[PDB]
Design a protein around this motif. Structure first.
Motif, PDB file in Angstrom:
ATOM      1  N   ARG A  44      17.362 -36.297 -12.415  1.00 19.98           N
ATOM      2  CA  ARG A  44      18.442 -35.344 -12.616  1.00 19.98           C
ATOM      3  C   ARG A  44      17.902 -33.939 -12.861  1.00 19.98           C
ATOM      4  NH1 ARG A  44      18.768 -33.922 -17.734  1.00 19.98           N
ATOM      5  NH2 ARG A  44      18.651 -35.425 -19.542  1.00 19.98           N
ATOM      6  N   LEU A  46      18.337 -30.250 -15.100  1.00 21.03           N
ATOM      7  CA  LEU A  46      18.316 -29.978 -16.515  1.00 21.03           C
ATOM      8  C   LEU A  46      19.656 -29.474 -17.000  1.00 21.03           C
ATOM      9  CD1 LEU A  46      14.966 -27.948 -16.541  1.00 21.03           C
ATOM     10  CD2 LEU A  46      15.355 -30.324 -17.320  1.00 21.03           C
ATOM     11  N   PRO A 103      22.945 -31.284  -9.601  1.00 23.40           N
ATOM     12  CA  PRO A 103      21.903 -30.620 -10.382  1.00 23.40           C
ATOM     13  C   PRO A 103      22.047 -29.121 -10.423  1.00 23.40           C
ATOM     14  CG  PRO A 103      20.985 -32.395  -9.148  1.00 23.40           C
ATOM     15  CD  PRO A 103      22.391 -32.259  -8.654  1.00 23.40           C
ATOM     16  N   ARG A 104      22.588 -28.499  -9.384  1.00 19.94           N
ATOM     17  CA  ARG A 104      22.756 -27.051  -9.328  1.00 19.94           C
ATOM     18  C   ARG A 104      24.078 -26.577  -9.914  1.00 19.94           C
ATOM     19  NH1 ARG A 104      21.163 -24.837  -3.548  1.00 19.94           N
ATOM     20  NH2 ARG A 104      21.388 -22.925  -4.773  1.00 19.94           N
ATOM     21  N   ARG A 109      26.652 -25.959  -3.888  1.00 15.07           N
ATOM     22  CA  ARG A 109      25.201 -25.908  -3.786  1.00 15.07           C
ATOM     23  C   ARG A 109      24.577 -27.233  -3.367  1.00 15.07           C
ATOM     24  NH1 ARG A 109      24.824 -22.458  -9.395  1.00 15.07           N
ATOM     25  NH2 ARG A 109      25.627 -20.489  -8.469  1.00 15.07           N
ATOM     26  N   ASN A 112      23.485 -34.547  -5.290  1.00 15.01           N
ATOM     27  CA  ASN A 112      22.330 -35.443  -5.318  1.00 15.01           C
ATOM     28  C   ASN A 112      22.812 -36.833  -4.932  1.00 15.01           C
ATOM     29  OD1 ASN A 112      20.003 -36.865  -5.833  1.00 15.01           O
ATOM     30  ND2 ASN A 112      20.143 -36.618  -8.076  1.00 15.01           N
ATOM     31  N   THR A 145      21.935 -24.336 -15.546  1.00 18.58           N
ATOM     32  CA  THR A 145      22.285 -23.211 -14.675  1.00 18.58           C
ATOM     33  C   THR A 145      23.622 -22.578 -15.031  1.00 18.58           C
ATOM     34  OG1 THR A 145      22.523 -22.523 -12.281  1.00 18.58           O
ATOM     35  CG2 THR A 145      23.133 -24.801 -12.882  1.00 18.58           C
ATOM     36  N   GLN A 147      25.212 -22.568 -17.980  1.00 15.91           N
ATOM     37  CA  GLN A 147      25.082 -21.859 -19.228  1.00 15.91           C
ATOM     38  C   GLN A 147      24.337 -20.541 -19.011  1.00 15.91           C
ATOM     39  OE1 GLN A 147      26.507 -23.539 -21.951  1.00 15.91           O
ATOM     40  NE2 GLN A 147      26.491 -21.520 -22.938  1.00 15.91           N
ATOM     41  N   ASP A 148      23.337 -20.579 -18.115  1.00 16.04           N
ATOM     42  CA  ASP A 148      22.582 -19.333 -17.907  1.00 16.04           C
ATOM     43  C   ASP A 148      23.315 -18.368 -16.981  1.00 16.04           C
ATOM     44  OD1 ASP A 148      20.580 -20.110 -19.691  1.00 16.04           O
ATOM     45  OD2 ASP A 148      19.331 -20.968 -18.118  1.00 16.04           O
ATOM     46  N   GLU A 149      24.137 -18.851 -16.038  1.00 15.86           N
ATOM     47  CA  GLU A 149      24.895 -17.953 -15.199  1.00 15.86           C
ATOM     48  C   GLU A 149      25.978 -17.190 -15.974  1.00 15.86           C
ATOM     49  OE1 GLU A 149      25.975 -18.979 -10.945  1.00 15.86           O
ATOM     50  OE2 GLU A 149      25.524 -20.943 -11.761  1.00 15.86           O
ATOM     51  N   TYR A 150      26.766 -17.955 -16.752  1.00 17.83           N
ATOM     52  CA  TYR A 150      27.922 -17.358 -17.389  1.00 17.83           C
ATOM     53  C   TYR A 150      28.217 -17.900 -18.770  1.00 17.83           C
ATOM     54  CZ  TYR A 150      30.190 -21.422 -15.037  1.00 17.83           C
ATOM     55  OH  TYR A 150      30.560 -22.652 -14.578  1.00 17.83           O
TER      56      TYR A 150
ATOM     57  N   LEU B  46      14.380 -22.778 -19.992  1.00 20.31           N
ATOM     58  CA  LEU B  46      13.759 -23.750 -19.126  1.00 20.31           C
ATOM     59  C   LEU B  46      13.426 -23.155 -17.778  1.00 20.31           C
ATOM     60  CD1 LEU B  46      16.319 -26.642 -19.779  1.00 20.31           C
ATOM     61  CD2 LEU B  46      13.967 -26.408 -20.684  1.00 20.31           C
ATOM     62  N   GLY B  51      11.687 -28.316 -15.136  1.00 17.40           N
ATOM     63  CA  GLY B  51      12.624 -29.093 -14.306  1.00 17.40           C
ATOM     64  C   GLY B  51      11.912 -30.156 -13.485  1.00 17.40           C
ATOM     65  N   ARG B  55      12.274 -34.158 -13.823  1.00 19.39           N
ATOM     66  CA  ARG B  55      13.024 -34.821 -12.763  1.00 19.39           C
ATOM     67  C   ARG B  55      12.109 -35.789 -11.999  1.00 19.39           C
ATOM     68  NH1 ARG B  55      17.144 -32.021  -8.411  1.00 19.39           N
ATOM     69  NH2 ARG B  55      17.787 -33.982  -7.420  1.00 19.39           N
ATOM     70  N   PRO B 103      15.373 -15.632 -20.687  1.00 23.25           N
ATOM     71  CA  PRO B 103      15.740 -17.032 -20.484  1.00 23.25           C
ATOM     72  C   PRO B 103      16.788 -17.230 -19.421  1.00 23.25           C
ATOM     73  CG  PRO B 103      15.431 -16.597 -22.771  1.00 23.25           C
ATOM     74  CD  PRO B 103      15.376 -15.258 -22.106  1.00 23.25           C
ATOM     75  N   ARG B 104      17.690 -16.278 -19.222  1.00 19.16           N
ATOM     76  CA  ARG B 104      18.750 -16.386 -18.225  1.00 19.16           C
ATOM     77  C   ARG B 104      18.341 -15.863 -16.856  1.00 19.16           C
ATOM     78  NH1 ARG B 104      24.293 -14.289 -20.616  1.00 19.16           N
ATOM     79  NH2 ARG B 104      24.930 -15.261 -18.653  1.00 19.16           N
ATOM     80  N   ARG B 109      21.519 -10.205 -17.948  1.00 19.87           N
ATOM     81  CA  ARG B 109      22.077 -11.231 -18.816  1.00 19.87           C
ATOM     82  C   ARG B 109      21.532 -11.181 -20.238  1.00 19.87           C
ATOM     83  NH1 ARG B 109      21.481 -15.742 -14.042  1.00 19.87           N
ATOM     84  NH2 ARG B 109      23.237 -14.918 -12.772  1.00 19.87           N
ATOM     85  N   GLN B 144      14.693 -21.827 -14.444  1.00 21.34           N
ATOM     86  CA  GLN B 144      15.377 -22.864 -13.655  1.00 21.34           C
ATOM     87  C   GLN B 144      16.698 -22.330 -13.104  1.00 21.34           C
ATOM     88  OE1 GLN B 144      14.245 -26.173 -12.952  1.00 21.34           O
ATOM     89  NE2 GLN B 144      15.951 -25.981 -11.496  1.00 21.34           N
ATOM     90  N   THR B 145      17.389 -21.482 -13.879  1.00 18.71           N
ATOM     91  CA  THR B 145      18.628 -20.873 -13.386  1.00 18.71           C
ATOM     92  C   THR B 145      18.469 -20.222 -12.021  1.00 18.71           C
ATOM     93  OG1 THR B 145      20.469 -19.292 -13.997  1.00 18.71           O
ATOM     94  CG2 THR B 145      18.224 -18.798 -14.798  1.00 18.71           C
ATOM     95  N   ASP B 148      18.241 -22.779  -9.376  1.00 20.24           N
ATOM     96  CA  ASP B 148      19.532 -23.441  -9.124  1.00 20.24           C
ATOM     97  C   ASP B 148      20.562 -22.482  -8.538  1.00 20.24           C
ATOM     98  OD1 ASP B 148      18.540 -25.931  -9.909  1.00 20.24           O
ATOM     99  OD2 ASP B 148      19.218 -25.695 -11.971  1.00 20.24           O
ATOM    100  N   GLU B 149      20.495 -21.175  -8.834  1.00 15.19           N
ATOM    101  CA  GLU B 149      21.416 -20.241  -8.232  1.00 15.19           C
ATOM    102  C   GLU B 149      21.187 -20.071  -6.724  1.00 15.19           C
ATOM    103  OE1 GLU B 149      22.803 -16.523 -10.371  1.00 15.19           O
ATOM    104  OE2 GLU B 149      21.002 -17.016 -11.486  1.00 15.19           O
TER     105      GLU B 149
END
Ligand SMILES: CC(=O)N[C@@H]1[C@@H](O)[C@H](O)[C@@H](CO)O[C@H]1O
Ligand SMILES: CC(=O)N[C@@H]1[C@@H](O)[C@H](O)[C@@H](CO)O[C@H]1O
Ligand SMILES: CC(=O)N[C@@H]1[C@@H](O)[C@H](O)[C@@H](CO)O[C@H]1O
Ligand SMILES: CC(=O)N[C@@H]1[C@@H](O)[C@H](O)[C@@H](CO)O[C@H]1O
Ligand SMILES: CC(=O)N[C@@H]1[C@@H](O)[C@H](O)[C@@H](CO)O[C@H]1O
Ligand SMILES: CC(=O)N[C@@H]1[C@@H](O)[C@H](O)[C@@H](CO)O[C@H]1O
Ligand SMILES: *C1O[C@H](CO)[C@@H](O)[C@H](O)[C@H]1NC(C)=O
Ligand SMILES: *C1O[C@H](CO)[C@@H](O)[C@H](O)[C@H]1NC(C)=O
Ligand SMILES: *[C@@H]1O[C@H](CO)[C@@H](O)[C@H](O)[C@H]1NC(C)=O
Ligand SMILES: *[C@@H]1O[C@H](CO)[C@@H](O)[C@H](O)[C@H]1NC(C)=O
Ligand SMILES: *[C@@H]1O[C@H](CO)[C@@H](O)[C@H](O)[C@H]1NC(C)=O
Ligand SMILES: *[C@@H]1O[C@H](CO)[C@@H](O)[C@H](O)[C@H]1NC(C)=O
Ligand SMILES: OC[C@H]1N/C(=N\O)[C@H](O)[C@@H](O)[C@@H]1O
Ligand SMILES: OC[C@H]1N/C(=N\O)[C@H](O)[C@@H](O)[C@@H]1O
Ligand SMILES: O=C1O[C@H]([C@@H](O)CO)C(O)=C1O
Ligand SMILES: O=C1O[C@H]([C@@H](O)CO)C(O)=C1O
Ligand SMILES: [Zn+2]
Lengths: 499, 499
Positions: A44, A46, A103-104, A109, A112, A145, A147-150, B46, B51, B55, B103-104, B109, B144-145, B148-149
């Motif tokens: 998976r 994170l 995962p994304r 995106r 899995n 992702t 949490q870190d995006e928004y 992270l 990741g 994983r 971190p973001r 951010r 990791q963000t 994943d973005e």
């Protein structure tokens, strides 16, 4: 007439006096788990529990334990099924890890496929053994992702991302899964994740906890709670409009507690106790049954409480087919000041109540629930009658809902050795005393309770505690996690189910 | 006249014959590290190494080890400084964890002030002991963000996010840091991260490794390499246009190898060896010195090789004040087919070469470098003269650059016990034999080499190997990581530096 015990010693562990036949024939009995706590990170992406436990290891547990490998239900899901089969359980509550199937985070995106296959195999295996799945879509493990995006549930963007995730779950698993839970314990992330920062994502006001990376404990819990309600309601609408052909049911999970006055002849304590019901239960149940927050919250929280528009109110009101009620304990309530201008103000202070397990005359409410070795005045005590009181209250206050008890259980210390851990008579006492009261409230008050899922199937990573406590009805050796061995409580539960 | 040994036994460990006074008085001697490998996750967000290792645990190392706690240089940075002070080192290469200060990922951010403070304290402490920092901005640990973005370096969005990150580093630390490295080993992420999926993020074509979550080994390495060059060049332009007042220098890090023909009288092997130089070194050095990829790559890779626009070519060409050259070993090259239509085609096959450590007549190139217990024909062997050959080639082919050797070192097995681990005479032999050749190439060819940083300061998490090998000049006990104890190699290096 049913008589249930409230104090030690209990005698409800005798299956001649209390067993599944005491309940209606269709009643579901099982156990519960959650994905972060049992699967491991293998296979998976994170999530914020990985993020939080690794960024703030002393918040993960006193042992700094986390869900990296845990009981490895990714590899050993069949052994979980085998425990359920041994119990002759008819239900199993588990959660889907959003980060395992998307995962994304955002569904566009990609998905899995191997993650989807993992849950298909588990579901198929449960059904093959006659176990009804109860699946939680979100047991706190938000993809990092998002949490870190928004900042996750702090932002309204969560609504559509959670909707698209839920849609994928319904599409892939809803032909077999007929009981869905949206969000685990609505109260918890707003307060612990964004208020006290005890839980992921770990946001709070600077003087509440200087380690928090950002936050505002006075405002963020309300924002997050609001977005949880909207996200929940959008998912329920999606389920009931687009997946009605599946013939299943969906609801939220509430953490319930009962509240009693610290001093039952003191009007101030009595008022604090009723405020607690509104601030703890009504915060979510008001919107779910009426489309509005409780008036006391409107009055107290003022400009910090978001409003629902007419469209939102209509979406949220009635957004459940049943309620998953988790129940562990009850607290005494007394008045406490609400210093809204203090830099360390938290949303939890808005209820104007201080909570204890001992009342004004020195009575402890019931048997020990959780020992706190750093501060023993902070020990938690349980109260079997509280499950009766909660169920009765839900029926009377909240329009006679269909209810499934989706968690109920107790820990034993991780310092015990295996033999002590397996002789978990304190867990039999806790479980049986609650089941006695649950049967009694169904019979006496006609509450529409149709199943009970004990916390937990097996020992796992406990949020905030690492591996320092055990909650399983089956034992797991952390030096070799393959086996799940029924403890005395699991053995008792097996006899209770098939007396 | 300098004579250096190529084969065991070596006699260069005698500081009467080889020491820092053999080199120019301003030459820098030190050690190197990287953030994922030494810090731990405490206090940071992270990244894709977290990741990937979580994983795909069997890709993290045979022991499933990761950088969660490692040698805890977050807590014990002062002990790292103390090792450097004990060595009388004049340089230290370390990396900044992007996820610790942003971190973001995206700077808008917010920044982690505590993360910034951690690096300020380290930098201040190094300078206070007369140690020159060499700071790598990106040693593979992408937030990791961002992966994943937009899949990180697969997308052109990385350029501005990396630029904003670098800008923050220059702003916060550039008053004290005068030597900056952009990206560690340009060749590695494209090939291992996006080709073979041995490294984070673990993308590849489905038949290369079915565990990869996505990818295309034939095209993605070229896309990622291209975006690394553009991101690097944008950061160098930012540094030289906006931070010239700091009076420092910046460059990329290349992984270098020398290549020799598997059969030195076979024109096909000789051609394969020259193709290897272009595909391994020229892939990046062509753009860095000329703004274009090597013609052989243009011809072979065709439509899979991106083009630079005139503006991009001008940005990339000359985008360094010096080069950080890592050097560990040399390979023999022989021809190999390039099956571009095969579903398991990789970018690494485009060079049309098979690499070995044994030549056609059975000669192993030098002493053992890394034993591979699963397949001993895959053992790696080293070649001290290769550092001479590489430096000479850079001077002659690549316009007489200023060079710092930013990594050079060798592992010893993690199965050795502490006593064996501390008696690391194989590491003294490796280090001294390379330093002998480095002095020789500076004197004979006038290569502008101004410092040498041995891999590693201490034992750490090794990418792909967990804790199953040790590279430190100082020993770390994994049951209690506080101390860093100089091994025989560290003790030797101390005498070499201050004979
Ligand atoms: C097999 C067995 O022991 N069944 C018992 C039943 O005899 C008893 O009357 C009931 C009371 O609820 O609990 C159950
Ligand atoms: C939540 C919801 O009501 N409905 C959606 C609708 O918007 C969508 O067009 C249709 C096909 O994708 O699936 C349904
Ligand atoms: C092995 C075992 O206990 N099996 C029992 C079965 O005998 C019983 O009919 C069923 C329903 O009560 O629960 C199950
Ligand atoms: C203190 C000491 O031993 N210094 C030696 C010096 O005597 C020797 O001539 C030189 C050769 O490069 O290596 C060094
Ligand atoms: C990379 C680069 O050349 N330059 C920037 C410029 O765009 C910016 O306006 C200025 C102030 O922020 O800092 C400088
Ligand atoms: C304790 C020790 O070794 N200190 C030496 C010092 O004597 C020498 O002057 C300096 C430059 O070579 O390197 C350092
Ligand atoms: C634990 O960790 C945080 C940093 O995440 C630190 O601020 C706090 O002081 C530590 N707690 C204790 C009790 O040491
Ligand atoms: C290791 O893990 C991957 C899953 O991430 C699996 O596909 C592969 O078979 C495993 N490797 C070995 C050698 O067992
Ligand atoms: C801050 O709150 C803590 C606990 O909530 C309390 O002990 C302390 O008195 C408060 N400080 C102020 C200034 O109110
Ligand atoms: C661990 O547990 C499983 C189940 O009991 C057992 O079969 C296996 O041999 C054990 N492994 C070790 C290494 O002890
Ligand atoms: C796929 O590549 C592997 C190693 O690269 C090789 O052993 C195998 O022959 C290849 N298969 C085909 C169909 O070319
Ligand atoms: C571990 O290492 C440090 C440094 O040697 C030592 O001071 C400390 O007592 C040790 N801790 C334990 C628990 O052994
Ligand atoms: O603390 C017991 C158990 N309690 C639960 N809530 O009260 C959580 O939903 C579950 O994840 C946790 O493990
Ligand atoms: O394998 C040794 C060492 N080698 C390096 N490249 O060759 C890496 O930059 C470093 O992170 C790794 O630990
Ligand atoms: O009452 C509550 O019970 C649980 C848990 O503390 C049981 O261990 C929780 O998450 C609440 O808010
Ligand atoms: O030649 C090389 O050396 C290193 C490493 O293998 C040393 O252990 C690496 O990352 C290369 O590409
Ligand atoms: Zn971890």
């Amino acid at each position: 007439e049913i008589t249930c015990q409230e104090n030690l010693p209990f005698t409800c562990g005798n299956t001649d006096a209390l067993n599944s036949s005491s309940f209606s024939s269709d009643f579901i009995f099982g156990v519960a788990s959650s994905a972060y706590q049992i699967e491991g990170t293998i296979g998976r992406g994170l999530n914020i529990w990985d993020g939080f436990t690794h960024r703030y290891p002393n918040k993960s547990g006193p042992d700094h334990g986390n869900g990296d490998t845990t009981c490895d239900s990714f590899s050993y899901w069949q052994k979980d099924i085998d425990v359920l089969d041994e119990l002759n359980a008819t239900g199993y509550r588990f959660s889907i890890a959003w980060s395992r199937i998307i995962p994304r985070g955002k569904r566009s995106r990609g998905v899995n496929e191997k993650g989807i296959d993992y849950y298909h195999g588990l579901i198929s295996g449960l059904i093959k053994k006659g176990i009804t799945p109860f699946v939680t879509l979100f047991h706190w493990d938000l993809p990092q992702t998002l949490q870190d995006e928004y900042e996750g549930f702090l932002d309204p963007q969560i609504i559509d991302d959670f909707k698209d995730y839920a849609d994928l779950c319904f599409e892939e698993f809803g032909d077999s899964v007929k009981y869905w839970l949206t969000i685990n314990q609505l109260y918890s992330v707003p307060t612990r994740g964004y208020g006290s920062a005890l839980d992921a994502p770990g946001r709070c006001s600077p003087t509440v906890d200087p380690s928090c990376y950002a936050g505002n404990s006075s405002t963020e819990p309300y924002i997050v709670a609001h977005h949880q309600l909207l996200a929940h309601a959008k998912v329920v609408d999606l389920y009931r409009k687009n997946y009605t052909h599946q013939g299943g049911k969906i609801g939220p999970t509430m953490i319930t507690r009962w509240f009693l006055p610290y001093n039952d002849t003191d009007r101030h304590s009595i008022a604090a106790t009723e405020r607690m019901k509104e601030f703890f239960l009504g915060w979510f149940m008001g919107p779910l049954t009426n489309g509005t927050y409780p008036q006391i919250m409107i009055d107290t929280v003022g400009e910090r409480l978001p409003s629902f528009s007419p469209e939102e109110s209509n979406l949220v009101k009635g957004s459940y087919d049943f309620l998953g009620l988790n129940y562990y304990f009850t607290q005494y309530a007394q008045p406490s000041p609400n210093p809204v201008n203090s830099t360390n103000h938290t949303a939890m202070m808005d209820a104007g109540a201080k909570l204890t397990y001992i009342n004004a005359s020195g009575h402890y409410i019931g048997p020990l629930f959780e020992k706190d070795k750093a501060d023993s005045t902070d020990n938690i005590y349980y109260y079997p009658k509280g499950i009766y009181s909660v169920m009765d209250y839900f029926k009377n206050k909240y329009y006679n809902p269909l209810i499934y008890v989706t968690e109920n259980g107790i820990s034993t210390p991780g310092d015990e050795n295996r033999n002590q851990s397996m002789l978990d008579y304190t867990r039999i006492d806790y479980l049986c005393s609650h089941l006695c009261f649950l049967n009694k409230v169904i019979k006496e008050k006609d509450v529409n309770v149709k199943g009970y899922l004990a916390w937990a199937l097996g020992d796992n990573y406990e949020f905030n505690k690492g591996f320092t406590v055990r909650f399983g009805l089956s034992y797991i050796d952390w030096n070799n996690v393959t086996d799940r061995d029924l403890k005395k409580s699991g053995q008792w539960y097996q006899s209770f189910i098939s007396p």
